[PDB]
Amino acid sequence: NEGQMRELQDQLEAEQYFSTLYKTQVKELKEEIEEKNRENLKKIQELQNAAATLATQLDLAETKAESE
Amino acid sequence: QMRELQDQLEAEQYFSTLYKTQVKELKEEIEEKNRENLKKIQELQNAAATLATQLDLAETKAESEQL
């Protein structure tokens, strides 16, 4: 009977180990995802800047053309 | 008592499984993102191409109308 107990306890310690391990894996991945979203957003913002200049030059060309 | 210990073991087992499944979901999500990004960048490239071509034609025309 004490054997059953000892074995169950062993099992429990094992699963505590794995449970913890994967619990941290999740955390890491969540962090990684958040980083990727941040970085992605930043790069899109840079693209938007790059496009803005074109848009303005065309705007001013257009209105300037619309005066003459 | 050891029924308590059985229950606790099974709760832990539940959690280990749960976390493994969550990891697989998240890895999936990451891959899908890496796909979607790629695709969208390519779409942007296509959309820029047209403007590029029109500008090229324009620049030729402007150079040629010169005196």
Author numbering:
A (entry chain D): 835 to 902
B (entry chain C): 838 to 904
What is the paper's account of this structure, in its own sentences?
Vertebrates have two highly related Rock proteins, Rock1 and Rock2, which share 65% sequence identity to each other. Both contain an N-terminal kinase domain, a centrally located coiled coil region and C-terminal pleckstrin homology (PH) and cysteine-rich domains. Rock catalytic activity is inhibited by a direct intramolecular interaction between the kinase domain and sequences within a large C-terminal fragment of Rock containing 200 residues of the coiled-coil region, the PH domain , and the cysteine-rich domain. To accomplish this task, Shrm3 is localized to apically positioned sites of cell-cell adhesion in polarized cells, where it directly interacts with Rock through a highly conserved domain on its C-terminus called the Shrm Domain 2 (SD2).
While binding affinity was somewhat reduced in this assay for the smaller 834–913 fragment, both Rock1 proteins were still capable of binding SD2 with affinities comparable to that observed between Drosophila Rock and Shrm. Together, these data suggest that there is a stable Shrm binding domain (SBD) composed of residues 834–913 of hRock1. Diffraction quality was greatly improved through the introduction of a triple alanine mutation, 884EKE886, suggested by the Surface Entropy Reduction server and termed SBDSER. Crystals of SBDSER belong to space group C21 and also exhibit anisotropy with diffraction extending to 2.5 Å along a* and c* but only 3.1 Å along the b* plane. Phases were determined using the SAD method, and the final model was refined against native data at 2.5 Å resolution to Rwork and Rfree values of 23.6% and 27.6% respectively. SBDSER crystals contain two parallel coiled-coil dimers in the asymmetric unit packed in a tail-to-tail arrangement. Each SBD monomer is an entirely helical segment ∼100 Å in length and the completed model minimally contains residues 838–902 from each molecule. The C-terminal end of each dimer is splayed open allowing the formation of a helical bundle beginning at residue 875. The SBDSER mutant that facilitates crystallization, positions 884–886, is located within the center of this helical bundle. The helix is noticeably kinked after the SBDSER positions suggesting that the substitutions at the SBDSER positions may have altered the overall structure of the SBD to favor the formation of a helical bundle between residues 875–902. Since SBDSER is dimeric in solution, crystal packing forces, perhaps accentuated by additional hydrophobic interactions found in the SBDSER variant, are likely responsible for the observed helical bundle.
